[PDB]
């Protein structure tokens, strides 16, 4: 009974591997060897954001490329005016163990969550003049990982269990549940058209889901350890994953293959955050050695090093217009690079 | 430059004052993390998602945290519990079937890369049931551990005045297992503090206070250039 199913699954895996091998007509490095390198990238810290008194664990830019939300272990969200370094708001949190924060594309709400298993949504534009909890989303059985807004009413969350969820903020219910992982889901990334999203987990695999159907489409392997970050390409046809094996990998949706591997012999530390530039030419990765590295996406060469953080760089962020990069670390400081 | 800009920066300064006051208020507490399996009794060992517990010893505020409802196999949320004062591990004694699992869990926590400089306070709960199990026979710790056939109790350490010799040998073997795992590595940055306790003890808070004082003393012996 079970033997036939196991044999069929093995045969299907072999067939898909053969399909990948037959679709691998050439290597990206061989094609891109004739492309001129980007040279040396020298980014200087332009703003230093102070006010957090604990480890910063999450950040998220706004759509206007000015407002910035950050989360830290002291139990408070701070909304920053990055141009003037002012603090627009300071939102207390019921649980001090916050691991994620999101900024709505409309700029009206922010979301946060962590070890309390609850996604709390805060209303920023109220007639009373203060920030108030809209509702508390409940239903997850594990610690709440990264969360991202689709619009003012739908949000996609990842938990410490092996499931992702789609929520309706107006009614506070779980519309769709995404199952299939065999480990703790750590990172999320939304496609620019908000029709697909990718999730990285602790099973050393990444999966592609569609929102409206709730069905897994593609599965990507190649990492030897836990995946901690994931980020789409600007064109929406590729994505990059960072893991704990000191290796960034570029994956493809249309070819369903590993496309490029970013690694150095001098890097032995895991990767915390992964982000792209506006054009996708530069890949920025936060590392455990207190530094952030800029990788040429096509040529897989190091372009520059970002240094100046005294602890673990825990989060990365690039503005929509691509003007600046904001890095947050465990030393309770956030720096804006340009 | 503009009047609205000045009002905004004044609001930011007020937010800064509030943040500084709140951080100063929250700075004056010691944070402890509590781990152990269902068998442990870790829920009731200090009489006074996330579980919250607060107790005060000698005007010192302690803030103990218990993480419930998760899976005990893989624990990757430990990284947010770094830089705590101590980790409290409660071991269910007198349960010979899961002593190996408890030892494996202690070994996994001790060798975690985020807890290299964090000490562990070890509690062996309800030693009473261990006493009746070793005094009534018909439950051989020799079967579960083959090392309990040439082991002899140390001549240096002493038992309780009324304690039987048979209880003490088993207690010392169980403590020796955890001590050996603790001393197998660590490079001296963090140490373990074994403790024998039961369900009716009321001195565990003082034990935690003394162990925390020792932990902070060893930390300042290295932070300040003495050792």
């Amino acid at each position, epitope marked *: 009974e079970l033997d036939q199913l196991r044999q069929e699954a093995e045969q299907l895996k072999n067939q898909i591997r053969d399909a990948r091998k037959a679709c691998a007509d050439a290597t990206l490095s061989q094609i891109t060897n004739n492309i001129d390198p980007v040279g040396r990238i020298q980014m200087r810290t332009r703003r230093t954001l102070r006010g957090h008194l604990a480890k910063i664990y999450a950040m998220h830019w706004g759509t206007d490329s*000015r*407002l910035l939300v950050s989360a830290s272990q002291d139990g408070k969200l701070i909304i920053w*005016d990055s141009y*003037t370094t*002012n603090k*627009v*708001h300071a939102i207390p949190l019921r649980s001090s163990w916050v691991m994620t924060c999101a900024y709505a594309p409309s700029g009206n709400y922010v979301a946060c969550g962590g070890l309390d298993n609850i996604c709390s949504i805060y209303n920023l534009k109220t*007639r*009373e*003049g*203060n920030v108030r909890v809209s509702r508390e989303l409940a239903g997850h059985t594990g610690y709440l990982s990264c969360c991202r807004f689709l619009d003012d009413n739908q949000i996609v969350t990842s938990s410490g269990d092996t499931t992702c969820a789609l929520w309706d903020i107006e009614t506070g219910q779980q519309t769709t549940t995404f199952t299939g992982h065999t480990g703790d889901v750590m990172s999320l990334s939304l496609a620019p058209d908000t029709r697909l999203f990718v999730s990285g987990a602790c099973d050393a695999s990444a999966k592609l889901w569609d929102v409206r159907e709730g069905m897994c489409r593609q599965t990507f392997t190649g990492h030897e350890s836990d995946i901690n970050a994931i980020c789409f390409f600007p064109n929406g046809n590729a994505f990059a994953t960072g893991s704990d094996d000191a290796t960034c990998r570029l994956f493809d949706l249309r070819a369903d293959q590993e496309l490029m591997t970013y690694s150095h012999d001098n890097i032995i530390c895991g990767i915390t955050s992964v982000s792209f530039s506006k054009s996708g030419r530069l890949l920025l990765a936060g590392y455990d050695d207190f530094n952030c590295n800029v990788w040429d996406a096509l040529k897989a060469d190091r372009a520059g090093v970002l240094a100046g953080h005294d602890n673990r760089v825990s989060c990365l962020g690039v503005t929509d217009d691509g003007m600046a990069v904001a890095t947050g670390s465990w030393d309770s400081f956030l720096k804006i690079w340009n | *430059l*503009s*009047a*609205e*800009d*000045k*009002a*905004a920066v*004044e*609001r930011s300064k*007020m937010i800064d004052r509030n943040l500084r006051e709140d951080g100063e208020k929250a700075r004056r507490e010691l944070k402890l993390l509590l781990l152990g399996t269902g068998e442990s009794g870790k829920s009731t060992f200090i009489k006074q998602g996330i579980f919250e517990t607060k107790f005060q010893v000698d005007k010192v505020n302690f803030h103990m945290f218990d993480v419930g409802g998760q899976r005990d196999e893989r624990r990757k949320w430990i990284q947010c519990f770094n830089d705590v004062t101590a980790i409290i591990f409660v071991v269910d004694s007198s349960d010979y079937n899961r002593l190996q699992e408890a030892l494996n869990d202690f070994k996994s926590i001790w060798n975690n890369r985020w807890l290299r400089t964090i000490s562990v306070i070890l509690f062996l709960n309800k030693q009473d049931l261990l006493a009746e199990k070793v005094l009534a026979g018909k439950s051989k710790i020799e079967d579960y551990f083959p090392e309990f056939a040439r082991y002899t109790t140390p001549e240096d350490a002493t038992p309780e005045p009324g304690e039987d010799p048979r209880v003490t040998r088993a207690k010392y073997f169980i403590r020796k297992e955890f001590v050996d795992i603790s001393t197998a590595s660590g490079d001296g940055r963090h140490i373990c503090y074994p403790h024998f306790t039961c369900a009716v003890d009321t001195e565990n808070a003082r034990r935690i206070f003394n162990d925390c004082k020792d932990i902070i003393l060893q930390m300042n012996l290295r932070e300040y250039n003495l050792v």
Partner: single-chain antibody
Amino acid sequence: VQLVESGGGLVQPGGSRKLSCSASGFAFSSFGMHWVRQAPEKGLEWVAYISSGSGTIYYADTVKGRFTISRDDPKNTLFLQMTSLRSEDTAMYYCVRSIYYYGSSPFDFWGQGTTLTVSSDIVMTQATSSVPVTPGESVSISCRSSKSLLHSNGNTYLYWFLQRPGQSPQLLIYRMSNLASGVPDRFSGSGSGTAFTLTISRLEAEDVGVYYCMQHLEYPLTFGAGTKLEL
């Protein structure tokens, strides 16, 4: 959100009287507050301002040294102490809320007002005073400034207020382009630096009040003469 003001009456010249405004429905401690003077048959005038934390206090030149503003945070009320009253202070006094953060609308809510009876600046010019109107038509109200209100940070500081007959002024447009909450999409504003215009489309019966033009580039704040639309 409710602002109730009390303490008016008939005062002999040279006397002293204190006005009080009680606030409810919002976080009083997080908002700055103003005092605005209406005059019996004239336009709005600015009196005083106190910050959220009482760090900064501003006064008009006509009331400096004789008027005092104070704030009570535990008891959500605002006080205005008047000394050496002249006949020029016979008017109606309003209390206006303000918060002043990035992307906010400061002059959003106004109080009911109290009637008091006794016995280098920027000129904001509204040349037209009365415009006959017909419902369903579109009209424009112009505004001119002595100094350009466009700042080096990219923001212009123009505020449009509507005062229906027998009611307190209501905010319509702030920073010349941002529509206030609760304002229908009929209203729109445009301009550049010195010249400004408020555009109204599909006029209704609720737009019969007097429109005012305010600047917020520097203290003291100045208002326009006022344009009245009559059906």
